[PDB]
Amino acid sequence: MASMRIPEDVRKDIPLTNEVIYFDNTATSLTPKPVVEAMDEYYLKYRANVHRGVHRLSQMATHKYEESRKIVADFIGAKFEEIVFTKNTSESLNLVALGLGHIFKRGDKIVTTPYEHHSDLLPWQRLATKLGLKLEFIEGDDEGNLDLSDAEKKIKGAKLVAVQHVSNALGVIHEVEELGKIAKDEGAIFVVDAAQSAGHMEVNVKKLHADFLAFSGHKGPMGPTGIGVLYIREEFFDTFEPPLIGGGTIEDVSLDGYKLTEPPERFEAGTPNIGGAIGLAAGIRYIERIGLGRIERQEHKLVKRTTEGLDELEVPWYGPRNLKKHAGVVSFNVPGLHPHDVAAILDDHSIMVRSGHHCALPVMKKLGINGTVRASFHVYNSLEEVETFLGVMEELVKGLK
Amino acid sequence: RIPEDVRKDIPLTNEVIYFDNTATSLTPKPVVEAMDEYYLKYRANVHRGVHRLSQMATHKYEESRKIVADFIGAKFEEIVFTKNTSESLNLVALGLGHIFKRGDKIVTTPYEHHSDLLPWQRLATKLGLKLEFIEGDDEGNLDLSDAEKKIKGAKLVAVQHVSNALGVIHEVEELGKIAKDEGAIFVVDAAQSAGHMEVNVKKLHADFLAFSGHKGPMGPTGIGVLYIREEFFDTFEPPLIGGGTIEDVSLDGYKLTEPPERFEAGTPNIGGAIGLAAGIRYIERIGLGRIERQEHKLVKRTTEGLDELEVPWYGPRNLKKHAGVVSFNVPGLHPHDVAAILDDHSIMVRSGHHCALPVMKKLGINGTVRASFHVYNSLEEVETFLGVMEELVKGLK
Ligand SMILES: *[C@H](N[C@@H](C)C(=O)O)c1c(COP(=O)(O)O)cnc(C)c1O
Ligand SMILES: *[C@H](N[C@@H](C)C(=O)O)c1c(COP(=O)(O)O)cnc(C)c1O
């Protein structure tokens, strides 16, 4: 929408960008000043709880919290009522397992990918172990490319399919639209972990054939910490059983029992993170002013240069060689050095990078490595930063071992 | 300095008379500045990275957890961050759900906020348990002799420290001694006590304790606490698991890590925990003693002014047992209407059932209007309240 120069105009709103080269955006994003200003105005100018209390402050907070839910719903192509606020993606996913637990029978089958983050693996493991389910992993290569033929066989008799949109370890962008169409043809519930897609590329629930979808405010959306989202497609309102219950979730309560209210309030127990939802809505508004298409483009350029530069240094990097299937994340290793050491040297030069397993241990074991070092980007990162990154990589790479 | 020196830090204080503190508190500038510093100067995820931003974030996050532990007399590792009291309470029910057998007994009070009632109701329903209520009066002072009777066979006792509808301060020390004496696990809902009066887990004999940053502690929204006494680390099943929760993981198995990370699934509300820690620091600069005295002084004046006006108020007549909350009703007028006219005068009050329908149904009322305080509220505010209240009751001829 807005006429902005990328990345110069985003950088102007983010003071830390003058201090460091921030390449750890898959862990969490830097926060623009206008997102913190939107939260600061709730705290200082209209501080109150919601649930439509008659007083003016509650009226204004409530109106802002509702606005925030709608902004989020539009961003995803969802209806207002299908959006539920959690603390993070992890909560959202656990809520899907706990909320659907009751519909599984011994011998049922959950299928996922072998690349999942622990948060999109552990709930399904625990649930499988407890109810005697089968948990099967669709097959794929070491770059993260899934065998879609194997996907069709695995999904066939599946009760539920849970997949990440993008891998936080490898940067592979899975073909979630195709996987969703398969799940639909086979009558399997489809859950998408969009923790690394939201705010970096397009995420639309109807395009993705999603039944549930989860993402985290603090990542691509450029919101604060402490705010997540769980999309619950309306088809499921009659079966999903709210895992958290109490204030705000009812029509009536007596000492003998209770009656739940309509969604979305049905799923939101107690005072919500009002400030976080306002912040996330400002994050989303900020993203839409830049445009998801231009964000993707800017990340693809950074990925292209970084990658070409590491080939020149003969530094192996992971994930798909086809850049059309590679998000703004480049995991790499320097043979002869431990990832933690590479990240430490990079930190002494003011370049922030992550090292280790990335909460994706099955990725590291599949590939047969201890960790990787990971550089991740966002729209505010620059080609200039990548050049200076390559410059220190170059120096670092000198000497044997 | 009290309350002027606190009011200097809250701009809203110059725009309205905020008497809706039990719903949520107003937030002082230093709380917001602390959260802004994280977002603008050391923004990063926690867990562990070598990079400097992550070192700082990790350090401040841990520091927050310590500040919260010390606030309530706990051990660093016994503090779990959640989104609010309601999540904390639900997590207690879900993580202990496995220890009950059909016919076991859960005991609570009859004045509970829905968040400290429904999880127990649900659990009793699904497990064939006995859910029983200790008796009390309309004020609502609990019958402690009845509590002995009821806690005897109990597997778990859940009580609120203070009622958000009546303002009654329960005798939690005593109820806690009883349940310990009877071998029951004691769970305390301190949503309305944290930040308004002393809450120490040792003194309270609590096994589990819950509170909300956004209320008395003058912290932000989205940050709750659950206290888990070290005794229960091997019984309590973490209801939410994944990132930051493990030691190892493979495609068909997982090993969980140690408290408190074992109970915190995914990227935590870093900015909230840091905001909460600065609210607790702000609270301590003032002192819980002074906060409680300031609020008692407002209740006492408010209450006598409403007697003078023939406006009935609920909860304990004994002010020693009455927190900083006064629920009342104007005869001839629905509470939502009293709240509107008060709002027209820039006085913020809450009306309705306050998510405590069993309180309303025990008293035989639809709801009440609720004026609630904090340390920054003033005597001059209470007087202006009583003035519009007077005009309001006069007009009703
Ligand atoms: C977040 N992963 C990062 C913390 C990282 O790798 O550095 C993530 C989640 C969990 O999101 P939370 O907000 O709950 O921490 C889930 N799925 C994926 C793919 C990622 O990256
Ligand atoms: C919070 N009650 C207020 C919203 C009000 O009475 O208006 C409360 C809870 C729930 O805490 P949350 O932060 O989850 O909403 C639980 N117990 C009590 C006693 C209160 O007041």
Coordinates of N, CA and C and ligand atoms in Angstrom, one line a residue, chain A residues 49-51 246-248 269-272, chain B residues 20-24 83-89 111-116 160-165 189-193 210-215 222-224 350 353-356 370 372, ligand 2:
Chain A
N49 N -10.1 -3.3 31.6 CA -10.4 -4.7 31.1 C -11.5 -4.6 30.1
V50 N -11.7 -5.7 29.4 CA -12.8 -5.8 28.4 C -14.1 -6.3 28.9
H51 N -14.7 -7.2 28.2 CA -16.0 -7.7 28.5 C -17.1 -6.6 28.6
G246 N -13.3 -20.8 32.4 CA -13.5 -19.9 33.5 C -14.2 -18.6 33.1
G247 N -13.7 -17.5 33.7 CA -14.2 -16.2 33.4 C -14.2 -15.9 32.0
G248 N -15.3 -15.4 31.5 CA -15.4 -15.1 30.1 C -15.9 -16.2 29.2
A269 N -10.2 -18.2 28.2 CA -10.4 -18.1 29.6 C -9.7 -17.0 30.4
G270 N -10.5 -16.1 31.1 CA -10.0 -15.0 31.9 C -9.5 -13.8 31.1
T271 N -9.0 -12.8 31.7 CA -8.6 -11.6 31.1 C -7.6 -11.9 30.0
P272 N -7.8 -11.5 28.8 CA -6.9 -11.8 27.7 C -5.7 -10.8 27.7
Chain B
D20 N -12.1 0.9 39.4 CA -12.3 -0.4 38.8 C -11.1 -1.3 38.9
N21 N -10.4 -1.2 40.0 CA -9.1 -1.8 40.3 C -9.2 -3.3 40.4
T22 N -10.4 -3.9 40.8 CA -10.4 -5.3 40.9 C -10.5 -5.9 39.4
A23 N -10.9 -5.1 38.4 CA -11.0 -5.7 37.1 C -9.6 -5.7 36.6
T24 N -8.9 -4.6 36.8 CA -7.5 -4.4 36.4 C -7.0 -3.1 36.9
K83 N -0.6 -16.9 31.1 CA -1.2 -15.7 30.7 C -2.1 -14.9 31.7
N84 N -2.7 -15.7 32.6 CA -3.4 -15.1 33.7 C -3.8 -16.2 34.8
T85 N -4.5 -15.7 35.8 CA -4.9 -16.5 36.9 C -5.8 -17.6 36.4
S86 N -6.7 -17.3 35.4 CA -7.5 -18.3 34.9 C -6.7 -19.5 34.2
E87 N -5.7 -19.2 33.5 CA -4.9 -20.2 33.0 C -4.1 -21.0 34.1
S88 N -3.5 -20.3 35.0 CA -2.9 -20.9 36.1 C -3.8 -22.0 36.8
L89 N -5.0 -21.6 37.2 CA -5.9 -22.5 37.8 C -6.3 -23.7 37.0
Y111 N -18.2 -18.8 47.1 CA -18.1 -17.4 46.6 C -17.1 -17.3 45.5
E112 N -16.7 -18.4 44.9 CA -15.6 -18.4 43.9 C -15.9 -17.7 42.6
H113 N -14.8 -17.1 42.0 CA -14.9 -16.5 40.8 C -15.0 -17.7 39.8
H114 N -15.7 -17.6 38.7 CA -15.8 -18.8 37.8 C -14.5 -19.5 37.5
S115 N -13.4 -18.8 37.4 CA -12.1 -19.4 37.1 C -11.6 -20.4 38.2
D116 N -12.1 -20.2 39.4 CA -11.7 -21.1 40.5 C -12.9 -22.0 40.8
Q160 N -10.3 -18.9 47.4 CA -9.9 -17.6 47.0 C -9.4 -16.9 48.2
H161 N -8.4 -16.1 48.0 CA -7.8 -15.3 49.1 C -8.7 -14.2 49.4
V162 N -9.1 -13.5 48.4 CA -10.1 -12.4 48.5 C -11.2 -12.5 47.4
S163 N -12.4 -12.3 47.7 CA -13.5 -12.3 46.8 C -13.6 -11.1 46.0
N164 N -13.7 -11.2 44.7 CA -13.7 -10.0 43.8 C -15.1 -9.4 43.7
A165 N -16.1 -10.1 44.3 CA -17.5 -9.6 44.3 C -17.9 -9.0 45.7
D189 N -6.2 -19.1 45.2 CA -6.5 -18.1 44.1 C -6.2 -16.8 44.7
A190 N -5.1 -16.2 44.5 CA -4.7 -14.9 45.1 C -4.9 -13.7 44.1
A191 N -5.8 -13.8 43.1 CA -6.0 -12.8 42.1 C -6.3 -11.4 42.6
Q192 N -7.0 -11.4 43.7 CA -7.4 -10.1 44.4 C -6.6 -9.7 45.6
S193 N -5.6 -10.6 46.0 CA -4.8 -10.2 47.1 C -3.4 -9.8 46.6
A210 N -2.0 -18.9 42.6 CA -2.2 -18.2 41.4 C -2.5 -16.8 41.5
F211 N -2.0 -16.0 40.6 CA -2.3 -14.5 40.5 C -2.1 -14.0 39.1
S212 N -2.5 -12.7 38.9 CA -2.5 -12.1 37.7 C -1.7 -10.8 37.7
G213 N -0.8 -10.6 36.8 CA 0.1 -9.4 36.8 C -0.7 -8.1 36.7
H214 N -1.7 -8.1 35.9 CA -2.5 -6.9 35.6 C -3.4 -6.3 36.6
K215 N -3.5 -7.0 37.7 CA -4.3 -6.5 38.8 C -3.5 -5.7 39.8
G222 N -1.6 -10.2 30.1 CA -1.0 -11.3 29.5 C 0.0 -12.0 30.3
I223 N 0.1 -11.7 31.6 CA 1.2 -12.4 32.4 C 0.6 -12.8 33.7
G224 N 0.4 -14.1 33.9 CA -0.1 -14.6 35.2 C 1.1 -15.4 35.8
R350 N -17.5 -0.8 38.0 CA -18.0 -2.0 37.3 C -19.4 -2.4 37.8
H353 N -22.5 -9.1 37.4 CA -22.2 -10.3 38.2 C -20.8 -10.6 38.6
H354 N -19.8 -9.9 38.0 CA -18.4 -10.0 38.2 C -17.8 -11.3 38.1
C355 N -18.4 -12.1 37.2 CA -18.0 -13.5 37.0 C -18.0 -14.3 38.3
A356 N -19.0 -14.0 39.1 CA -19.3 -14.7 40.3 C -20.8 -14.8 40.5
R370 N -19.7 -2.1 41.5 CA -18.5 -2.3 42.3 C -17.4 -1.3 42.1
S372 N -13.8 -0.3 43.4 CA -12.7 -1.0 44.0 C -11.4 -0.1 43.9
Ligands
LIG2 C1 -10.2 -11.5 38.0 N1 -11.5 -10.8 38.1 C2 -11.7 -9.5 37.3 C3 -11.7 -9.6 35.8 C4 -13.0 -8.8 37.8 O1 -13.6 -9.4 39.0 O2 -13.6 -8.0 37.2 C5 -10.1 -12.8 38.9 C6 -9.8 -14.1 38.5 C7 -9.4 -14.3 37.1 O3 -8.1 -13.6 36.9 P1 -7.8 -13.2 35.3 O4 -6.6 -12.3 35.2 O5 -7.7 -14.5 34.7 O6 -8.9 -12.7 34.5 C8 -9.7 -15.1 39.4 N2 -10.1 -15.0 40.7 C9 -10.4 -13.8 41.1 C10 -10.8 -13.7 42.6 C11 -10.4 -12.6 40.2 O7 -10.8 -11.3 40.6

